[PDB]
């Protein structure tokens, strides 16, 4: 229950390679495990302490990876919650707004989707082409 801080980066790496190979359901499992490991360590730290914060920041990219797997397998409810949790702490996280926007769109929360995509553009205008595609799609569906 502490000698597996060393496992995390390896599990992380295996997840990434699975994802890249197209084994997305299995990458999700890996990310989930890496996350559980980090959270257990974090449970041993005082919230708001430097160690707690460092672990929280290590979880974020792993939790986003997990959400990305969930987008691919078309399961949106965890994406919404996990991204919202990240965003309630780190409100400048571009990937989190983007994934949450996609999940909102998939479940027909058009207004909420637009709000998140707008935020993505405010933080990274270089994303205009991809965001515009997502919004174009969305807008078509709003047209009915």
């Amino acid at each position: 229950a502490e000698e597996k801080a060393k496992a995390v980066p390896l599990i992380h790496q295996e997840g990434n390679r699975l994802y890249r190979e197209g084994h997305v359901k299995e990458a999700a499992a890996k990310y989930y495990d890496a996350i559980a490991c980090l959270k257990n360590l974090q449970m041993k730290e005082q919230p708001g302490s430097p160690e707690w914060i460092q672990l929280d920041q290590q979880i974020t990219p792993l939790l986003l990876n997990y959400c990305q797997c969930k987008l691919v397998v078309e399961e949106y409810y965890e994406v919404l919650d996990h991204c919202s949790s990240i965003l309630n702490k780190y409100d400048d996280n571009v990937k989190a707004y983007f994934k949450r926007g996609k999940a909102h769109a998939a479940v027909w929360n058009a207004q909420e989707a637009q709000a998140d995509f707008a935020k993505v553009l405010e933080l990274d205008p270089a994303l205009a082409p991809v965001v515009s595609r997502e919004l174009q799609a969305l807008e078509a569906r709003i047209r009915q």
Partner: peptide, 7 residues
């Protein structure tokens, strides 16, 4: 980098 990429 890309939105679909992990990390």
């Amino acid at each position: 980098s890309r939105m679909e990429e992990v990390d």
